[PDB]
C-alpha cells in the first residue's frame, strides 16, 4: 500500500523479534518512571509526603474524553419555566407578584460563613452553573391555537401563572384579561413556509441573558465555521499521509436541519503547554494517539557469514554476540532506547550499574563502539545524559588499547583524560571521540545539520524536521547515491579509526552494515515528524532550550526523564529496526479528542480568574483563604476524564502556590461553545443581588404596624401588609457604619450590647456592611415567631457576623368582628432587622397591571425542524467536495 | 493562613502557654491572638529552593 515498505532485494527481509505498539509504550513508559521513583524512596532514608504511586488506565481515560464531545450543554424543550406567581389576599382587585427565580436562587448551595473558604467558593460555583443549566434552551414546537383569524399562542408558553386570582377576580376584569390573553398573538403567524414561531412572553433578566447568547451562537457559528475545521483537518491528513475513500463532504443543508457546532479544530496549542508540571503527561498522550504498531526486524543473517563449499564458512568477529537472545530484562531495556531516538529530547538513557549481573568483559568494550554510532550528542539536541556519553569514551578507550593482535604504536598526550593518544601506524588523532556537548564531535551530528525548517506545519507550535544523521525518509523511494557509497561522516571516521588500530576484521563488519543503519534512521524519521506531530509534541521555544539549559546545569520546566539501560541493551539495540505496519488505531479521533480536552481547561481557566478576585473585593469574608481553595472548588465541578489527564504524572501532589497562581494569569483561551455559554453566565453575576446574597443589611427598632382600621372594606380593598424588605436605604448621613474589625472588638471588651441599645433608642440605623449573607424569603398571615420578629443580624457561640437573614411579608388577614381596638395591644412589638436589595422581588401591583410583564421577545422553532449535532462527524479521515482557498 | 498572608501556628513556636489561656483574662486573650498574628513566614532562597 505504501512505496517503501516493497522490499525487493533480500537485504532488509529478515526474521520478526518481538513487537510494539502505541497502546503499550505509554502504560511501559509510565512504568518505568513511577518505579524508578518507588525504589530509591525504598533504599534511602526520605522524608516526605506519601504520595501513592498508581499507574492509570491509559485506554480509560482517552474513551472517557470521547465520550464527552458527545455531550450536549443546551436541551430541548417546548415551553419555557413558571417565572412568575401571585399571591391572592383578602383583597380583590389587587394583588402582588414574586418572581420564582429568586424563590429558586433562594437555595443553591450552603450558608455563607465567615470561616469555612472553600465552601463559600462552591456556593458561588453552584450557583452559576445553576444560571447556565436553566437558561440555555432551545424552545422548539411550542402548542398553538387559533382564536378569529389570527394565531394566539397557547397561555402554557407564556412565563405567567394566575389560576389562583380567577375565582377572587370581579367579572368586569375577566373580560379586561381575556383580551390580554387574545392578545399574545403569533406575530407574522398567517403565512406558510415561515418555518419559526415568534411570540412574546415573560422571563427573568438572568435566564433571558443565556437565552440570547444561545440563540445568537446558531445565527453566526454554521456552514463556514464547518468549512474552516474541515479544511484543517485536509492538511493534517496531507502531512501524516493517510488514504482517502472515494466519498467527499457536500455542503447541502436541508431545509428543515439546523447544525450546532460546538468545538473548534485549529487548536491554539499554548493552552496544553500552560499546565503546570504537565510536561510527562503530554508526553504520554503523545505515545497513545501516535505510534504506529510495529515489529523489530533483526538483519539478514548472510551478512556475517558466507558458505563456500561445504565445510568452508568465513566467520564473523563478534560471533559469540550475534548468537545471543536478549533475556526480558534486557528486552525492556532495548524498548527505552528506541522509545529515546523516538522522542529526541525529552528522553535521556543512564547506566544502570548493577551488582548482580555478570557480564563478560568483552561486551562492554564492544558496546563502547556501538554507542558511538547510534546516539546523538550534538549541537543541537541530546539522547544521552553528561556521565552516560562519559562511560562511553572510557568504554573505547579501553576498546582500542587492548590489542589482541600484534601492537600497533601509540602516543599519549599530555592529559590524562581518555582517548587523548594517537593510535595507529599513521598516527590517526583519537582526540575528537571525546563527548563535547556544544559541538557534538564523537557521536552522530558531527558534520550534520539534524534539525531543518521546510515548510509551515498544522500545529504552529512545533515546526521542525528531525533528520537522525543527515538522511531523508525519501532515500527510500527515490535513492541518490549507490548501494556503496551509503555513507555519512559521523560513521565514516569510526571506520577509519578502526582500521588503523589493527581492528580491520570488525571494520569489515560495521562497513558491511551500512546500509542496514541508515535504513532504520530513515525509518525513525518517518515516525517523527510525520506521525508523532500532535498538539501533545514539544514547541520549538522548549525545544531549543533543552540543551544549553542541560550543560549549565539551570532549572527548567521541561526537565527530561531520565531512563536507564544497561551494557548488552546497548548491542541488542543495534541490530534492530522497529519498521511500523499498521498506524494507530485514534490518530483519526485523535484531534477531536485533543479538542474538548484544550475546551475544558479553558472553561477550568474562567472558573478560577472571577474566583480570585473575591479576596480583593470582599476581604473580610475570605480572613483564611488561600489560592488553592478556588483550586480545589473547581475541580470537584469538573469532568474527571479531563483531570485525570492532568495528573498523569501524579502532579496534583506537587504543586507550591505560586505555579497555580502562574496558570490563571496566562491568556490562552480556546474558545468553543460552553466558554461562550459560560462567559455570559459570569457577566449575570458581576453584582451578586442576582445571586440572593448582599451586604446591604440594617438594624433600626421599628414596632409592628398597627392599623387602627375604621372602615373594613376600604382596609380590605387596599391589601395591607408589612415586610422588613426596604424600597431605598437611607441616607449616608444619620446612620453608624459598623465592620468586621470593629464588632468584634466590641464583643471581647464587653461593649457590644451596650453601645448596640444606644443606638437603638435615639432612633438611628446601623449598616452591618462588609460581608456577604444567605438571604430567604418567607411569607406568614398570623404572628411569626421570635427568631422571624427580633431575629438579630448576628448570633454568639465571640460573635457570628455573617448569619443568614430572612425577608418575611406579613398579610394582614382581616374578618368582620375585630375591633378596632383589637389589633391595638398596649406594649408593642418591635423588629430590627431591615434589608434592601434593589431587586423587583415582591411588588403589590393591581389587576390592571397583572400581564404587564409581557416584554421578552422568545424566539421558537416549528415542529417540522431538527436539531442535530455535528461535532462527532469531525474525525480526520474525512475529505470535502469544494476545497478551502 | 490571614488575610493572604501566612503564619505560623503557636506551637510551632517554642513556648507552652496552653495552661496559662484559661486564667487569662478575656480583655487580653483577644490581644494575645493579635500579637500571636505577627509571626509572619518569609519566604526564602536557600541554594535556589523555596
Redo the contacts between chains.
Keep these: 500500500q505504501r512505496p517503501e515498505r516493497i522490499k525487493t532485494t533480500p537485504y532488509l527481509e529478515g526474521d520478526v523479534l518481538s513487537s510494539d505498539s502505541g497502546p503499550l509504550l505509554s502504560v511501559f513508559a509510565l512504568q518505568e518512571i513511577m518505579q524508578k521513583v518507588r525504589q530509591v524512596q525504598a533504599d534511602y532514608m526520605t522524608a516526605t509526603r506519601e504520595v501513592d504511586f498508581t499507574v492509570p488506565d491509559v485506554q480509560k481515560i482517552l474513551d472517557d474524553i470521547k465520550a464527552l464531545a458527545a455531550e450536549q450543554v443546551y436541551k430541548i424543550v417546548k415551553v419555557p419555566s413558571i417565572s412568575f406567581r401571585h399571591i391572592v389576599m383578602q383583597s380583590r382587585d389587587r394583588v402582588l407578584r414574586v418572581d420564582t427565580y429568586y424563590e429558586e436562587m433562594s437555595q443553591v448551595g450552603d450558608v455563607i460563613t465567615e470561616d469555612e473558604p472553600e465552601k463559600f467558593y462552591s456556593t458561588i460555583i453552584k450557583k452559576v452553573r445553576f444560571i447556565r443549566g436553566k437558561g440555555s434552551f432551545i424552545l422548539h414546537d411550542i402548542p398553538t391555537r387559533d382564536h378569529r383569524g389570527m394565531e394566539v399562542a397557547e397561555p402554557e408558553v407564556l412565563g405567567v401563572e394566575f389560576k389562583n386570582v380567577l375565582p377572587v377576580l370581579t367579572a368586569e376584569h375577566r373580560a379586561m384579561i381575556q383580551n390580554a390573553l387574545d392578545g399574545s398573538i403569533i406575530e407574522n403567524g398567517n403565512v406558510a413556509t415561515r418555518d419559526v414561531d415568534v411570540f412574546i412572553g415573560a422571563c427573568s433578566e438572568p435566564v433571558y441573558r443565556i437565552y440570547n447568547r444561545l440563540q445568537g451562537y446558531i445565527e453566526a457559528v454554521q456552514l463556514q465555521e464547518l468549512r474552516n475545521s474541515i479544511g484543517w483537518l485536509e492538511r493534517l491528513g496531507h502531512r501524516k499521509r493517510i488514504t482517502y475513500s472515494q466519498e467527499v463532504l457536500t455542503d447541502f443543508r436541508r431545509q428543515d436541519t439546523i447544525w450546532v457546532l460546538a468545538l473548534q479544530l485549529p487548536v491554539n496549542p499554548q493552552v496544553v503547554w500552560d499546565v503546570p508540571r504537565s510536561s510527562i503527561a503530554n508526553l504520554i498522550m503523545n505515545i497513545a494517539t501516535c505510534l504506529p504498531t510495529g515489529e523489530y526486524i533483526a538483519p539478514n543473517p548472510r551478512i556475517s557469514s558466507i558458505t563456500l563449499t561445504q565445510r568452508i564458512t568465513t566467520t564473523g568477529p563478534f560471533a559469540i554476540l550475534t548468537g545471543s537472545t536478549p533475556t526480558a530484562q534486557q528486552l525492556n531495556d532495548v524498548r527505552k532506547i528506541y522509545l529515546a531516538l523516538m522522542f529526541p529530547g525529552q528522553i535521556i538513557l543512564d547506566l544502570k550499574i548493577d551488582p548482580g549481573e555478570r557480564m563478560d568483559p568483552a561486551v562492554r568494550m564492544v558496546a563502547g563502539v556501538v554507542g558511538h554510532l547510534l546516539f546523538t550528542a550534538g549541537g543541537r539536541f541530546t539522547n544521552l545524559t553528561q556521565n552516560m556519553a562519559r562511560q562511553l569514551d572510557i568504554a573505547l578507550n579501553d576498546y582500542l588499547l587492548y590489542m589482541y593482535n600484534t601492537r600497533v604504536q601509540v602516543n599519549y598526550g599530555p592529559t590524562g583524560e581518555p582517548l587523548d593518544f594517537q593510535i595507529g601506524r599513521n598516527q590517526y588523532d583519537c582526540n575528537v571521540f571525546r563527548a563535547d556537548f556544544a559541538t557534538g564531535t564523537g557521536y552522530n551530528g558531527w558534520a550534520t545539520i539534524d534539525v531543518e525548517y521546510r515548510e509551515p506545519a498544522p500545529y504552529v507550535h512545533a515546526q521542525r524536521y528531525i533528520r537522525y544523521c543527515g538522511i531523508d525518509s525519501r532515500e527510500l523511494i527515490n535513492p541518490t547515491t549507490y548501494g556503496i557509497g551509503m555513507t555519512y561522516h559521523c560513521y565514516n571516521e569510526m571506520l577509519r579509526m578502526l582500521v588503523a588500530a589493527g581492528k580491520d576484521s570488525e571494520a569489515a563488519y560495521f562497513r558491511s552494515m551500512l546500509p542496514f543503519h541508515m535504513v532504520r534512521f530513515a525509518r525513525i524519521n518517518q515516525i517523527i515528524n510525520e506521525d508523532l506531530h500532535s498538539v501533545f509534541s514539544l514547541p520549538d521555544d522548549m525545544f531549543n532550550a533543552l540543551l544549553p539549559d542541560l550543560i549549565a546545569g539551570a532549572?527548567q520546566n521541561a526537565d527530561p526523564v531520565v531512563l536507564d539501560v544497561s551494557w548488552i541493551s546497548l548491542w541488542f539495540a543495534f541490530n534492530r529496526s522497529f519498521e511500523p505496519t499498521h498506524r494507530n488505531e485514534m490518530l483519526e479521533v485523535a484531534p477531536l479528542i485533543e479538542s474538548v480536552y484544550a475546551s475544558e481547561l479553558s472553561v477550568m481557566k474562567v472558573d478560577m480568574r472571577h474566583l480570585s478576585l473575591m479576596?480583593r473585593r470582599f476581604?473580610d469574608v475570605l480572613?483564611?483563604?488561600?489560592p488553592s481553595h478556588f483550586w480545589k472548588a473547581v475541580l470537584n465541578d469538573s469532568p474527571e476524564a479531563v483531570k485525570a489527564v492532568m495528573n498523569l504524572s501524579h502532579s496534583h501532589n506537587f504543586i507550591?502556590i505560586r505555579d497555580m497562581m502562574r496558570w490563571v494569569m496566562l491568556p490562552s483561551l480556546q474558545p468553543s461553545l460552553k466558554l461562550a455559554l459560560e462567559e455570559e453566565a459570569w457577566a449575570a453575576a458581576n453584582d451578586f443581588e442576582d445571586l440572593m446574597l448582599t451586604d446591604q443589611v440594617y438594624m433600626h427598632r421599628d414596632m409592628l404596624p398597627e392599623p387602627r382600621l375604621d372602615d373594613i372594606e376600604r382596609f380590605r380593598q387596599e391589601g395591607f401588609y408589612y415586610t422588613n424588605m426596604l424600597e431605598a436605604p437611607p441616607e449616608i448621613d444619620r446612620v453608624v457604619q459598623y465592620t468586621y474589625e470593629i464588632a468584634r472588638?466590641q464583643a471581647?471588651?464587653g461593649q457590644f450590647r451596650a453601645a448596640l441599645r444606644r443606638i437603638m433608642d435615639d432612633d438611628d440605623w446601623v449598616r452591618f456592611g462588609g460581608v456577604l449573607r444567605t438571604v430567604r424569603v418567607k411569607f406568614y398571615d398570623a404572628r411569626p415567631p421570635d427568631d422571624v420578629l427580633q431575629g438579630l443580624p448576628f448570633s454568639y457561640d465571640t460573635i457570628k457576623y455573617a448569619t443568614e437573614t430572612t425577608i418575611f411579608y406579613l398579610i394582614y388577614n382581616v374578618e368582620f368582628s375585630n375591633t378596632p381596638d383589637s389589633l391595638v395591644l398596649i406594649n408593642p412589638t418591635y423588629t430590627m432587622t431591615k434589608v434592601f436589595i434593589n431587586k423587583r422581588i415582591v411588588e403589590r401591583v393591581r389587576v390592571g397591571q397583572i400581564l404587564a410583564v409581557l416584554n421578552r421577545r422568545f424566539v421558537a422553532y416549528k415542529g417540522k425542524m431538527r436539531i442535530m449535532d455535528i461535532t462527532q462527524s469531525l474525525k480526520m479521515g474525512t475529505k470535502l467536495a469544494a476545497p478551502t482557498v
Excluded at 480572613?623 to 488561600?626: C, G, L, S, V
Aim: hydrophobic share 35%; charged share 10%.
Design positions: 532549572h479576596q476581604p480572613i483564611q483563604a488561600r507550591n472588638l471581647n471588651m
